[PDB]
Design an enzyme around this catalytic site. Structure first.
Site, PDB file in Angstrom:
ATOM      1  N   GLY A  28       0.812  -1.204   0.000  1.00  0.00           N
ATOM      2  CA  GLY A  28       0.000   0.000   0.000  1.00  0.00           C
ATOM      3  C   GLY A  28       0.843   1.250   0.000  1.00  0.00           C
ATOM      4  CB  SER A  29       1.788   4.005  -1.802  1.00  0.00           C
ATOM      5  OG  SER A  29       1.062   3.995  -3.013  1.00  0.00           O
ATOM      6  CB  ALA A  31      -1.467  11.490   1.379  1.00  0.00           C
ATOM      7  CE1 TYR A  32       0.642   4.528   4.337  1.00  0.00           C
ATOM      8  CE2 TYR A  32      -1.381   5.281   3.277  1.00  0.00           C
ATOM      9  CZ  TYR A  32      -0.429   4.299   3.481  1.00  0.00           C
ATOM     10  OH  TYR A  32      -0.568   3.101   2.817  1.00  0.00           O
ATOM     11  N   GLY A  33       2.305   8.070   3.393  1.00  0.00           N
ATOM     12  CA  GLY A  33       3.546   7.327   3.120  1.00  0.00           C
ATOM     13  C   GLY A  33       3.195   5.990   2.491  1.00  0.00           C
ATOM     14  CB  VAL A  35       2.815  -0.283   4.140  1.00  0.00           C
ATOM     15  CG1 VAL A  35       3.008  -1.554   4.969  1.00  0.00           C
ATOM     16  CG2 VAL A  35       2.296   0.820   5.035  1.00  0.00           C
ATOM     17  CE  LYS A  50       2.708   3.951   9.141  1.00  0.00           C
ATOM     18  NZ  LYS A  50       1.283   4.250   9.522  1.00  0.00           N
ATOM     19  CG  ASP A 165      -3.892   4.755  14.953  1.00  0.00           C
ATOM     20  OD1 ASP A 165      -3.255   3.924  14.250  1.00  0.00           O
ATOM     21  OD2 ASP A 165      -3.363   5.786  15.416  1.00  0.00           O
TER      22      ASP A 165
HETATM   23  C1  LIG Z   1      -4.410   6.985   6.323  1.00  0.00           C
HETATM   24  S1  LIG Z   1      -4.368   5.596   5.206  1.00  0.00           S
HETATM   25  O1  LIG Z   1      -5.721   4.988   5.047  1.00  0.00           O
HETATM   26  C2  LIG Z   1      -3.313   4.318   5.898  1.00  0.00           C
HETATM   27  C3  LIG Z   1      -3.422   3.017   5.436  1.00  0.00           C
HETATM   28  C4  LIG Z   1      -2.605   2.011   5.953  1.00  0.00           C
HETATM   29  C5  LIG Z   1      -1.654   2.301   6.926  1.00  0.00           C
HETATM   30  C6  LIG Z   1      -0.839   1.297   7.471  1.00  0.00           C
HETATM   31  N1  LIG Z   1       0.133   1.506   8.359  1.00  0.00           N
HETATM   32  C7  LIG Z   1       0.667   0.346   8.716  1.00  0.00           C
HETATM   33  C8  LIG Z   1       1.724   0.276   9.630  1.00  0.00           C
HETATM   34  C9  LIG Z   1       2.916  -0.380   9.304  1.00  0.00           C
HETATM   35  C10 LIG Z   1       3.968  -0.395  10.209  1.00  0.00           C
HETATM   36  C11 LIG Z   1       3.858   0.265  11.430  1.00  0.00           C
HETATM   37  F1  LIG Z   1       4.915   0.225  12.293  1.00  0.00           F
HETATM   38  C12 LIG Z   1       2.675   0.944  11.765  1.00  0.00           C
HETATM   39  C13 LIG Z   1       1.615   0.965  10.857  1.00  0.00           C
HETATM   40  C14 LIG Z   1      -0.014  -0.661   7.989  1.00  0.00           C
HETATM   41  C15 LIG Z   1       0.153  -2.073   8.021  1.00  0.00           C
HETATM   42  C16 LIG Z   1       0.620  -2.751   9.152  1.00  0.00           C
HETATM   43  C17 LIG Z   1       0.733  -4.138   9.120  1.00  0.00           C
HETATM   44  N2  LIG Z   1       0.404  -4.857   8.056  1.00  0.00           N
HETATM   45  C18 LIG Z   1      -0.068  -4.261   6.962  1.00  0.00           C
HETATM   46  C19 LIG Z   1      -0.222  -2.860   6.913  1.00  0.00           C
HETATM   47  N3  LIG Z   1      -0.932  -0.016   7.256  1.00  0.00           N
HETATM   48  C20 LIG Z   1      -1.558   3.602   7.402  1.00  0.00           C
HETATM   49  C21 LIG Z   1      -2.377   4.601   6.887  1.00  0.00           C
HETATM   50  C1  LIG Z   2      -2.216   2.691  18.179  1.00  0.00           C
HETATM   51  C2  LIG Z   2      -3.634   2.101  18.223  1.00  0.00           C
HETATM   52  C3  LIG Z   2      -4.262   2.441  19.568  1.00  0.00           C
HETATM   53  C4  LIG Z   2      -5.607   3.105  19.381  1.00  0.00           C
HETATM   54  C5  LIG Z   2      -5.552   4.548  19.852  1.00  0.00           C
HETATM   55  C6  LIG Z   2      -6.198   5.450  18.803  1.00  0.00           C
HETATM   56  C7  LIG Z   2      -6.153   6.905  19.225  1.00  0.00           C
HETATM   57  C8  LIG Z   2      -6.912   7.747  18.214  1.00  0.00           C
HETATM   58  O1  LIG Z   2      -7.235   9.026  18.794  1.00  0.00           O
HETATM   59  C9  LIG Z   2      -8.111   9.730  17.870  1.00  0.00           C
HETATM   60  O2  LIG Z   2      -7.392  10.174  16.645  1.00  0.00           O
HETATM   61  C10 LIG Z   2      -8.220  10.954  15.699  1.00  0.00           C
HETATM   62  C11 LIG Z   2      -7.439  11.364  14.420  1.00  0.00           C
HETATM   63  O3  LIG Z   2      -7.065  10.213  13.655  1.00  0.00           O
HETATM   64  C12 LIG Z   2      -8.752  12.203  16.445  1.00  0.00           C
HETATM   65  O4  LIG Z   2      -9.504  13.066  15.561  1.00  0.00           O
HETATM   66  C13 LIG Z   2      -9.594  11.799  17.683  1.00  0.00           C
HETATM   67  O5  LIG Z   2     -10.010  12.987  18.374  1.00  0.00           O
HETATM   68  C14 LIG Z   2      -8.786  10.887  18.634  1.00  0.00           C
HETATM   69  O6  LIG Z   2      -9.619  10.356  19.673  1.00  0.00           O
END
Ligand SMILES: C[S@](=O)c1ccc(-c2nc(-c3ccc(F)cc3)c(-c3ccncc3)[nH]2)cc1
Ligand SMILES: CCCCCCCCO[C@@H]1O[C@H](CO)[C@@H](O)[C@H](O)[C@H]1O
Ligand SMILES: CCCCCCCCO[C@@H]1O[C@H](CO)[C@@H](O)[C@H](O)[C@H]1O
Length: 337
Positions: A28-29, A31-33, A35, A50, A165
């Site tokens: 996956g790619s 705007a966040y970055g 993976v 990531k 999250d």
């Molecule tokens: C904002 S967008 O929708 C978005 C989509 C995917 C991710 C996204 N972030 C991670 C991810 C990877 C490594 C980390 F250390 C933390 C998060 C993954 C992930 C983790 C494990 N296995 C598959 C995928 N996906 C972050 C943002």
């Molecule tokens: C790392 C996974 C643990 C779960 C904790 C999730 C904390 C999310 O926290 C949320 O993030 C939102 C933005 O994405 C904010 O808009 C919300 O106010 C906030 O409650």
């Protein structure tokens, strides 16, 4: 001692990673970055790596990078995404520009595992038990998820579950006070979400599939009734109280005639999760002690967190301050057992 890094083009940038991580493959790619899946030769684990995009492009990006790192480092629980590693190719602060985060590879969310099927009672007990166990931990750190839903739930084929999250792979699971942009919120917004998830697992149907914001509200009020007088008393906004005062009072349906055939413990827990008045909803620790979870409940392995200082991430700082802060979080990282 630094690991030896290697350079590789992937998702249209040069990824630079320790050689322990092999066989990089983009999942996956955005705007966040982006993976990649990889194999971690060092632990023997399949991992997601990531690479943050534009982590220090602006104050807002820097601030967010620091919060993401700090939050990941503090989450250490079996039912919550944690950090296996964090690395930068950079050898000093002066060259620090990229941040990579590593966790277990997660190939499936709760949707991907259930596929709109009714699950057995036993299987729902196991899934829900875990959500609640992760939420006890999260809430003990003084965090509210606020958008808990099946897409934010990683579930492997052994039905082992982690709260996320981000969508791994709607507004249907949101508390009515979140839908109504209520200024204040408690941690039971998340319990509401759990009830919606649990109903749908039992029945095979989304509980409140509204077509839009107001249809969503109408569906909710239909199951749980219009606000009673105790609840109306706690409404600050004159427009919200005048709206409510003008509703035709509806009674809260009988959940036994909604969840036909379900374990009576399951109906009882749902009645406790899905109260309109959030002050009245069961908490996670309370739900974990409920008889519905008899088979899974261990009051000695339902751990809590040290509260999490969210003040350090809501400061108004300068780019190069957030970046040095983030750089120290990288350097200080201690791998888990
Ligand atoms: C904002 S967008 O929708 C978005 C989509 C995917 C991710 C996204 N972030 C991670 C991810 C990877 C490594 C980390 F250390 C933390 C998060 C993954 C992930 C983790 C494990 N296995 C598959 C995928 N996906 C972050 C943002
Ligand atoms: C790392 C996974 C643990 C779960 C904790 C999730 C904390 C999310 O926290 C949320 O993030 C939102 C933005 O994405 C904010 O808009 C919300 O106010 C906030 O409650
Ligand atoms: C017409 C539909 C109205 C939805 C009523 C939502 C009631 C939610 O419950 C309310 O949660 C608040 C936090 O948001 C608390 O401050 C209130 O004390 C609590 O009663």
């Amino acid at each position: 001692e630094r690991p030896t890094f290697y350079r590789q083009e992937l998702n249209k940038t040069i990824w630079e990673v320790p050689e322990r991580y092999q066989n990089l493959s983009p999942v996956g790619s955005g705007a966040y970055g982006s993976v990649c899946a990889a194999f971690d030769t060092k632990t023997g684990l399949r991992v997601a790596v990531k690479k943050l995009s534009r982590p220090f492009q602006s104050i807002i990006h820097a601030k967010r990078t620091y919060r993401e790192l700090r939050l990941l480092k503090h989450m250490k629980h079996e039912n919550v995404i944690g950090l296996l590693d964090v690395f930068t190719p950079a050898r000093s602060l002066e060259e620090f520009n990229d941040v990579y985060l590593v966790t277990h590879l997660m190939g499936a969310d709760l949707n991907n595992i259930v596929k709109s099927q009714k699950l057995t009672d036993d299987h729902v007990q196991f899934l829900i038990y875990q959500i609640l166990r992760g939420l006890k931990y999260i809430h003990s750190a003084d965090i509210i998820h606020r958008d808990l839903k099946p897409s934010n739930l990683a579930v492997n084929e052994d039905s082992e579950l982690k709260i996320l999250d981000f969508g791994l792979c709607t507004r249907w699971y949101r508390a009515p006070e979140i839908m109504l942009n209520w200024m204040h919120y408690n941690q039971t917004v998340d319990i509401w979400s759990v009830g919606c998830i649990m109903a749908e697992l039992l029945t095979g149907r989304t509980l409140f599939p509204g077509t839009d914001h107001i249809d969503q509200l109408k569906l909710i009020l239909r199951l749980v009734g219009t606000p009673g007088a105790e609840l109306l008393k706690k409404i600050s906004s004159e427009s919200a109280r005048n709206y409510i005062q003008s509703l035709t009072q509806m009674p809260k349906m009988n959940f036994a005639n909604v969840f036909i055939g379900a374990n009576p413990l399951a109906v009882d827990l749902l009645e406790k999760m899905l109260v309109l008045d959030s002050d009245k909803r069961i908490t996670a620790a309370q739900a974990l002690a409920h008889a519905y979870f008899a088979q899974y409940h261990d009051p000695d392995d339902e751990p809590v967190a040290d509260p999490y200082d969210q003040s350090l991430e809501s400061r108004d700082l300068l780019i190069d301050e957030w970046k040095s802060l983030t750089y120290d979080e990288v350097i200080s990282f201690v791998p888990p057992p």
